Design brief:
Two copies of one chain form a homodimer. Chain A is an alpha/beta fold. Helices cover 33% and strands 12% of the residues of chain A. Chain A is built from 13 helices and nine strands. The complex binds a molecule of 2 linked components (NAG-NAG) (2 copies) and 2,3-di(butanoyloxy)propyl butanoate. It is classed as hydrolase.
């Protein structure tokens, strides 16, 4: 694990701060914040209005979120600047108190990138609750890269990318704060996820790794969005947030929680939006930026992916 | 093109008939039928309730559709049996009058497979209006094949599949009835579609091949579902269905029709369902059957894909 100074941000603080929102509070003065990091093709509200913004509110938190533009499609390393800055702000703004981070898809990759390369926030996050995180990226994005129709962060979320290589070699496939990873074998966005083993993209060593089929059986189906929104996912997420270990506890959930429908406590209209989540995200991706190469690693990450290829060529020491 | 007898169906006619229905009519006695063939992961109503079922009704047709089970995920060759049987039935049931066929995604591949290998229906279809057809399959399905998480028809819709090989070697990449193909470069399901040329998966030789960006500009974005549901798609489809040439006519549409939102004449609720179309389809796909090989070609198609691999091995003469 890197153990030096935080790297400088490439974005100015005013830009990073403007990407951070808390519900009914300024980040500089917020009670019990939880930081929500959204998925590719979405803003914070788009990812979470139908699920963890109201659900975390009803668990006693002030939900906060970042919306790195455009729709989490740009450089995952810049998306992470938004998250690191947000943790620093919300830690201070809540009285120098650790806060939880809850993520969907790329948001989990972002959270682990921040914890890996910005050591100052390790003492500021008490837990990570990642839904369908793609720490290894996804094998499904390869053909899109080959056609040059991939946004910056989609290149970086392809299995074998320079970014996922650097994360792995820097130690980022092992949990850094107590982490729960809730994911599903029947994920049409992030693969591989089927083995219930370290091979899965959502798996972290020493994490609480919860593949839904391992608990609910092989016929249990929640997809990439269901991983975030289902009643089963809510019970695991609530367990992780409430737990004194910082990880969800097997005692808190079981076969009777294996409900694939959107969380019981959501309003009817939140359930509708939760079910449809992938459709607006897919449309935002298709309308967003596209390039023919993976964004360069920032200098702090380059030593961990020597020999991989990005826009400027082959990464050197 | 094959020019002999229709192959026998593998499914009983009672099963094929049970998969066909018409809005408010029996297929055996129907005025002005249009046969709608749905996309992968859907039934007829799921594909078209939000778009061409009401829209074709307002153009004066009786919409009819097939729902090959499960959700078009099984053998594309069996799905085509439903379509061929339906044309035979609707031709006779409308007084021995040719009828139009309108399709989404795999439905267009099915229509072209039927016209290629079942010569009896060529004189019974007066035109094909295909939205985002994948006659060449899609390059995006390869990684799912490699993980053995692909339904029968997803294997067959993979670029390079035995099925797509057989179709093109039998002559199926050239239109057989007057055909309009409406598709979009910004398709997240079917690729490649970006060239506005014969390389595109939706392209047929001698067809009316309408890539939306060629008409509406490089910044025009409709996705795989938008290709079916947009106001632009409605204007092109209306032109194709009314045209005395059997194909859409460039005189009937232009830049002022380049509205990417769901067709104007849809109800508010239909527009909502139209925009969300990919989400229930993706959910059905991940819940449906999966296998580790491409279904065998039926004997009538084997001579056209010698050397390709299916479940039983390498196709031979
Ligand atoms: C997404 O990322 C691109 C690439 O980093 C950003 O575009 C660059 O913006 C800087 C200044 O903001 C320019 O000097 C560069 O020339 C731009 N590069 C390209 C390739 O256009 C873009 O601003 C980012 N988008 C958002 C919404 O923040
Ligand atoms: C999808 O296709 C499979 C394979 O053809 C069908 O499975 C067959 O179904 C019946 C028994 O239920 C028999 O013809 C075969 O023994 C089955 N084959 C296999 C490999 O299981 C299946 O029924 C189809 N699904 C639907 C919904 O029609
Ligand atoms: C043969 C059908 C394949 C399928 O269904 O999955 C493809 C995904 C990928 O495409 C994207 O752009 C990812 C954006 C989330 O598309 C979706 O599933 C999202 C829409 C429900």
């Amino acid at each position: 694990l890197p153990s030096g100074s935080d790297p400088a941000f490439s974005q100015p603080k005013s830009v990073l701060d403007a990407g951070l929102t808390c519900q009914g509070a300024s980040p500089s003065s917020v009670s019990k914040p939880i930081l929500l990091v959204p998925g590719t093709g979405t803003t914070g509200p788009q990812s979470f209005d139908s699920n963890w913004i109201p659900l975390s509110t009803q668990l006693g938190y002030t939900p906060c979120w970042i919306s790195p533009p455009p729709f989490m499609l740009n450089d995952t390393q810049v998306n992470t600047e938004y998250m690191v800055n947000a943790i620093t702000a919300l830690y201070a703004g809540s009285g120098n108190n650790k806060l939880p981070v809850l993520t969907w898809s790329q948001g989990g990759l972002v959270a682990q990138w921040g914890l890996t390369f910005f050591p100052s926030i390790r003492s500021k996050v008490d837990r990570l609750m990642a839904f369908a995180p793609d720490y290894k990226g996804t094998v499904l994005a390869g053909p899109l890269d080959a056609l040059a129709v991939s946004a910056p962060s989609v290149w970086q979320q392809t299995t074998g990318s320079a970014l996922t290589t650097a994360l792995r070699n820097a130690g980022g496939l092992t949990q850094i704060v107590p982490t729960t990873n809730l994911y599903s074998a029947t994920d049409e966005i992030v693969q591989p996820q089927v083995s219930n083993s370290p091979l899965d993209s959502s798996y972290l060593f020493n994490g609480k790794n919860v593949q839904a089929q391992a608990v609910c059986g092989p016929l249990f189906v929640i997809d990439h969005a269901g991983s975030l929104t289902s009643q089963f996912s809510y019970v695991v997420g609530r367990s992780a947030l409430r737990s004194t270990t910082g990880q969800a506890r097997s005692a808190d959930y079981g076969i009777t929680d294996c409900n694939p429908l959107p969380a019981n406590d959501l309003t009817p209209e939140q359930k509708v939006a939760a079910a449809a989540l992938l459709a607006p995200a897919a449309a935002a991706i298709v309308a967003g930026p596209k390039q023919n190469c993976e964004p360069d690693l920032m200098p702090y990450a380059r030593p961990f992916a020597v020999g991989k290829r990005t826009c400027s060529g082959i990464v050197t020491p």
